[PDB]
Amino acid sequence: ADFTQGADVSGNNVTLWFKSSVNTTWVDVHYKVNSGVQQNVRMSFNAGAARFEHTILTAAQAEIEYFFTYNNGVPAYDTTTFTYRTNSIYSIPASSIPQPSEGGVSLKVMNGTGGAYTDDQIYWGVIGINPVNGKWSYLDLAGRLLPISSDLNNAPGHLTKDGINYANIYHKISDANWVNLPKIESGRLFLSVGSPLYMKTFDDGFAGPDLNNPTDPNLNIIFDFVAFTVDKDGYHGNTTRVDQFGFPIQHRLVNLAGNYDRTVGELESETRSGLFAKYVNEVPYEFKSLGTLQAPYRILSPMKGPFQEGGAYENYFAGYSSISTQDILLGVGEASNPEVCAALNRHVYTEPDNWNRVDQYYQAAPANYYAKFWHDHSIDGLAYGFCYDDVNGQAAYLEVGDPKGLIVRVGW
Ligand SMILES: OC[C@H]1O[C@@H](O[C@@H]2[C@@H](O)[C@H](O[C@@H]3[C@@H](O)[C@H](O[C@@H]4[C@@H](O)[C@H](O[C@@H]5[C@@H](O)[C@H](O)O[C@H](CO)[C@H]5O)O[C@H](CO)[C@H]4O)O[C@H](CO)[C@H]3O)O[C@H](CO)[C@H]2O)[C@H](O)[C@@H](O)[C@@H]1O
Ligand SMILES: OC[C@H]1O[C@@H](O[C@@H]2[C@@H](O)[C@H](O[C@@H]3[C@@H](O)[C@H](O[C@@H]4[C@@H](O)[C@H](O)O[C@H](CO)[C@H]4O)O[C@H](CO)[C@H]3O)O[C@H](CO)[C@H]2O)[C@H](O)[C@@H](O)[C@@H]1O
């Protein structure tokens, strides 16, 4: 008659839930709040979560004693009495992932902020190219890629900030448990806390946040994103700190055959405030302001800071190679070759025998210590700290040919 049960807390409310693994079509919950009149409620079935739920208002502060009556076939059964009063990305059972449709992947955006934000305060949006017709599109909750356009910015329901209209392509975590992510080219899953992002869409693309612009509408918004392509060869995706860090993210990919289940991202035990505080202590002086200039919204990548052309540290790599600091940090020009770029960022360039020896990376200056930071505080030391961190398999990148589920957790 097995079941799992629990009490989800959100704001001042407590949602009792009952998930049956048997032949159950109805569930009554019987509860007492600080020993009051016994409430007996026929619970509602939440299809997305595949569980019965009943929300008790303004009771998060209270003591709740509850048990359930449920059927298993014809007869009814009672559970024992439970009492109120993990959230880990690993706690989502693979068995609970719904089968994706049309060669897609089931996507869950999960709230891991430990009470910092509620589900209805975390926003997400998927934008990318639909390979069906090559049209730039956004994902709806039905799993459909809808074409974006300039008109979308002004369509009914559009967003507005300081008198300017922006496409409303975003959803709240509270809007869905799972969404089908169909095949998509250069997709991005934008994530933001407190508000959506404000990004102009066009008939042939969109303009994202410009962290070099003092008046960018997203400068004072805490956001991040995951990148993915879903094609005939399956799911391929990553988190990235190549441009900025907004908040901890974990990215778990699970396959159909049941032999692939991998997760990359910041360690779940790292806190956002922890990371800002450690960043300014751990990195050498030249990299410190990357963590302060646009605090508390983000930590900046070096080329968005004083390592840029004309900046105070525009010659940070000067003695080490003849190749410019800017070429190195962005993997362009004389550092367009991935292995060269990688070795320079890691300070192993002058020792070819060490290019693929992880324990020798970042052992002397000058080096990309911003990139090093993300490796030090990420699962399995994997991170996209700079553009070519995938050299020697060091990036927070995952792929599988038969994807079932992708879980993306917003940490804090
Ligand atoms: O790095 C310095 C420059 O950074 C730029 O901004 C970055 C921006 O370009 C990047 O956008 C991501 C897209 O590049 C990415 O699109 C994917 C392709 O990268 C990729 O091709 C592979 C290729 O990697 C390999 O070499 O050969 C394969 C042969 O087929 C090929 O498949 O193909 C993918 C499959 O189509 C394609 O999706 O998509 C991502 C989203 O999914 C984008 O995030 O993102 C960076 C981080 O945000 C940006 O820094 C600047 O524009 C430049 O000025 C800088 O010099
Ligand atoms: O300046 C150096 C270069 O930096 C480039 O930006 C990279 C960006 O390219 C990288 O995007 C990844 C892709 O690497 C990844 O590609 C997959 C292939 O690796 C695989 O073999 O094929 C599959 C298709 O089946 C591809 O998906 O795909 C993911 C998901 O879309 C992308 O996120 O990510 C880096 C970290 O953000 C980023 O720095 C830039 O694009 C180059 O133009 C530039 O020369």
Backbone angles phi, psi at 147, to 5 degrees: -60, 135
213 and 323 assigned to the same domain: no
Query: How many Cβ atoms from other residues are within 10 Å of residue 288's Cβ?
Result: 17
290 three-class SS: helix
d(CA 121, CA 379): 26
Residue nearest atom 18 of ligand 2, based on CA coordinates = 236
Ligand 2 atom at shortest distance from the alpha carbon of 233: 25
Q: Report chain breaks in the chain, C–N > 2.5 Å, as residues after which they occur.
A: 85
94 and 31 assigned to the same domain: no
Residue nearest atom 21 of ligand 1, based on CA coordinates = 186
Q: What's the domain range around 329?
A: 269-395
CB distance 231 to 185 below 8 Å: yes
Pocket (CB within 6 angstroms of ligand 1): 185-188, 227-229, 240, 242-243, 330-332, 387
3-state helix, strand, coil in the chain (%, to 5): 15, 35, 45
Structure tokens at 212: 């070099």
170 and 298 assigned to the same domain: no
Ligand 2 atom at shortest distance from the alpha carbon of 236: 27
- The number of angstroms, rounded, from the C-alpha of 145 to the middle of its chain's C-alpha atoms is 20
140 and 234 assigned to the same domain: yes
Obtained via which technique?
Answer: X-ray
* DSSP bridge pairs for 24: none
CA atoms within 13 A on the CB side of 199: 26
123 and 245 assigned to the same domain: yes
Structure tokens at 155: 């369509």
d(CA 169, CA 152): 9
Cα-to-centroid distance, 104 and ligand 1 (Å): 21
Domain count, the chain: 3
109 and 30 assigned to the same domain: no
Is there an atom of ligand 2 within 6 Å of 132 CB? Answer: no
Domain boundary at 85, 112, 146, which?
A: 85
Is there an atom of ligand 2 within 6 Å of 316 CB? Answer: no
Ligand 1 atom at shortest distance from the alpha carbon of 240: 47
377 and 278 assigned to the same domain: yes
Ligand 1 atom at shortest distance from the alpha carbon of 330: 2
Q: Distances in Å between the alpha carbon of 20 and those of 50, 181, 380?
A: 9, 27, 35
Structure tokens at 53: 């739920």
